[PDB]
Design a protein around this ligand. Structure first.
Ligand SMILES: Nc1nc2c(ncn2[C@@H]2O[C@H](COP(=O)(O)O)[C@@H](O)[C@H]2O)c(=O)[nH]1
Ligand SMILES: Nc1nc2c(ncn2[C@@H]2O[C@H](COP(=O)(O)O)[C@@H](O)[C@H]2O)c(=O)[nH]1
Ligand SMILES: Nc1nc2c(ncn2[C@@H]2O[C@H](COP(=O)(O)O)[C@@H](O)[C@H]2O)c(=O)[nH]1
Ligand SMILES: Nc1nc2c(ncn2[C@@H]2O[C@H](COP(=O)(O)O)[C@@H](O)[C@H]2O)c(=O)[nH]1
Ligand SMILES: Nc1nc2c(ncn2[C@@H]2O[C@H](COP(=O)(O)O)[C@@H](O)[C@H]2O)c(=O)[nH]1
Lengths: 303, 318
């Protein structure tokens, strides 16, 4: 029994919406291949309830899903069961725009009209790339795209796999581009979880010890990714890096995690100083050669 | 577990889609302690525009309206119908025949007019009360859902009710009885149909009689009494008693000829399912099952119509 109780009616519509579309899809046969029209397709539902079911939900609202067959396919290729996706969004209000499902597995990002256009723009190629690389990639994993209409207002959302662990705490965040010079602001430098940048990183001497095992895979991955982003003539994307300090945690065991769920996590190396878990993925790709090449190096340095 | 809502006509796919949709939604809605007055003016309305998506069985564009859903859910409960069952009966496979039956013959789906839906609203509060205080024991139509479908910009109203007839037992003869003083008979056109709808004068001509025996006759006549009086209270007129007769032996042979043909439990029913069914008196000639319900509830005035109706239906059985 799902009430879709959330701190805000937008979020209730979202939960209602994700629940409705996933159910709907469960009655849609899984096709032998995606078709070009699936890339221009959408489900639209308009709800108008008179004197009924008002407790958590608005009486009137619209919910639109973009390209449901493509995103259902992406979920699969990313190793994600539709029923778990649904459960993550609906069992409980997502929490604090940049939201997270209650179980921290999926990030829910508000985006713009042009963003959604940019997405349509790259979606066939992005899909094809996901196929070719068998789901293994540092790129953002796009799970669903949606427009909500509440109180006459439209709101676009993209749902992604969370870069960070969902049960492990992060002690560092470093947004990295590799160019110029970027730093953390005074105002921000004193927040609980500071979003440091390139220079703040190098001026700390911070390195990441994953061995040459993990580094070989990671770098091979990184280049094919940024090459793809470049071939798409895209840029200004960062490498989000999270650092979890095991020991500090002690102040179901520490450092323990499920690689199939925390897809970006990486164990520290034997021959390494402190014991930690790193999280590394490419974020912010919705907007060339020079940027890629550079970003590729700067990243291959800290490691 | 996939449901395609495959059907001969888009309207039917939409119906299946809608009952399925509204039942799931209702499942995330607490069962109230009691119904509230707004519940009697409530409705749900969904509007779908699919673009290049999910077009095999459903239209791309349609609307589904459920009237007073909280009331009808509660009605289903008081008639001992589980929502899952109802949903399955409607959605597992297309209704068949406007007048439809669920593929499993448990429920009837009648296409009705805007006026009908209006009349349903007029009487809905009192009907519910009357169903509460007779504990669901009535010859009246038992209403389970009311819907408006929209396909190709055309509106279609439907009411879902329980089948007057058994869902297993075959009917071999049926009558529509009113008791009117006017003449009422089966047309020449009708008589040549497979299962003709005979009328008042045909039933009398045939010397027909229904042998239910005294304990059942009383329980029936007591239902009829409050039912018609209730209908009388409301402005209601010109409803009929639907009478279906099932011949036990004839069915046994028909079954027999059904196997032999393919080659190339004894006149009983569940009274919690076949709610209008009565066995024949243990002293009847032929062994029989009857089904008897009032239908169509949406000079002579209602009170006198009821009175007429009553005395006739009372002389129909023995
Ligand atoms: N916990 C978490 N934070 C993220 C993730 N992706 C991006 N972020 C953070 O959320 C912020 C909001 O997005 P942005 O400000 O870059 O538009 C980002 O700057 C980044 O610090 C993620 O997957 N998990
Ligand atoms: N008495 C009553 N009639 C209604 C109500 N809602 C719809 N109707 C009637 O039912 C028919 C169809 O209404 P519609 O739902 O198509 O607007 C019309 O005759 C309309 O007046 C209601 O809440 N109360
Ligand atoms: N659509 C709609 N129609 C109504 C509603 N209330 C009444 N009607 C229609 O208006 C007629 C007159 O209302 P009444 O005088 O019987 O209360 C009803 O028989 C019904 O057809 C309503 O709330 N919604
Ligand atoms: N099997 C079955 N037939 C019904 C039921 N109610 C009405 N009918 C049939 O529907 C017709 C009467 O309603 P009509 O659709 O003409 O208004 C008659 O042919 C009658 O036999 C029912 O509950 N079950
Ligand atoms: N009443 C009755 N009729 C039968 C029986 N067996 C066959 N008949 C009838 O006799 C005719 C021949 O049936 P058949 O033997 O060809 O199936 C058919 O009309 C069939 O309905 C039976 O056991 N009882």
């Amino acid at each position: 029994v799902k009430l879709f109780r959330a701190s805000e009616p937008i979020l209730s519509v979202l939960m209602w919406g994700v629940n409705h579309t996933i159910n709907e899809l469960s009655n849609v046969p899984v096709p032998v291949m995606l078709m070009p029209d699936d890339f221009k397709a959408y489900s639209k539902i308009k709800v108008d309830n008179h004197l009924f079911n008002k407790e958590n939900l608005p009486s009137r609202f619209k919910f639109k899903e973009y390209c449901p067959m493509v995103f259902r396919n992406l979920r699969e290729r990313f190793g994600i069961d539709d029923q778990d996706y649904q459960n993550s969004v609906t069992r409980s209000a997502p929490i604090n725009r940049f939201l997270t499902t209650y179980d921290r597995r999926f990030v829910i990002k508000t985006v713009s009209s042009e963003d959604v256009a940019e997405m349509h723009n790259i979606l066939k190629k992005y899909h094809q790339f996901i196929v070719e690389c068998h789901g293994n990639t540092l790129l953002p994993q796009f799970l669903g795209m949606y427009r909500l209409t509440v109180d006459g207002v439209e709101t676009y959302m993209v749902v992604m796999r969370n870069v960070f662990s969902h049960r492990l705490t992060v002690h560092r965040k470093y947004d990295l581009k590799g160019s110029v010079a970027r730093e953390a602001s005074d105002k921000e430098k004193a927040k609980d979880l500071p979003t440091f940048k390139d220079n703040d990183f190098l001026n700390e001497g911070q390195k990441l010890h994953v061995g040459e095992e993990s580094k070989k895979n990671f770098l091979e991955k990184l280049k094919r990714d940024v090459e793809f982003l470049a071939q798409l003539k895209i840029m200004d994307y960062s490498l989000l890096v999270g650092i979890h300090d095991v020991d500090r945690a002690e102040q179901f065991g520490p450092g323990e995690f499920d690689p199939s769920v925390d897809v970006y996590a990486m164990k520290s190396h034997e021959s390494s100083p402190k014991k930690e878990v790193y999280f590394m993925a490419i974020i912010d790709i919705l907007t060339p050669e020079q940027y890629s090449k550079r970003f590729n190096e700067f990243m291959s340095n800290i490691l």
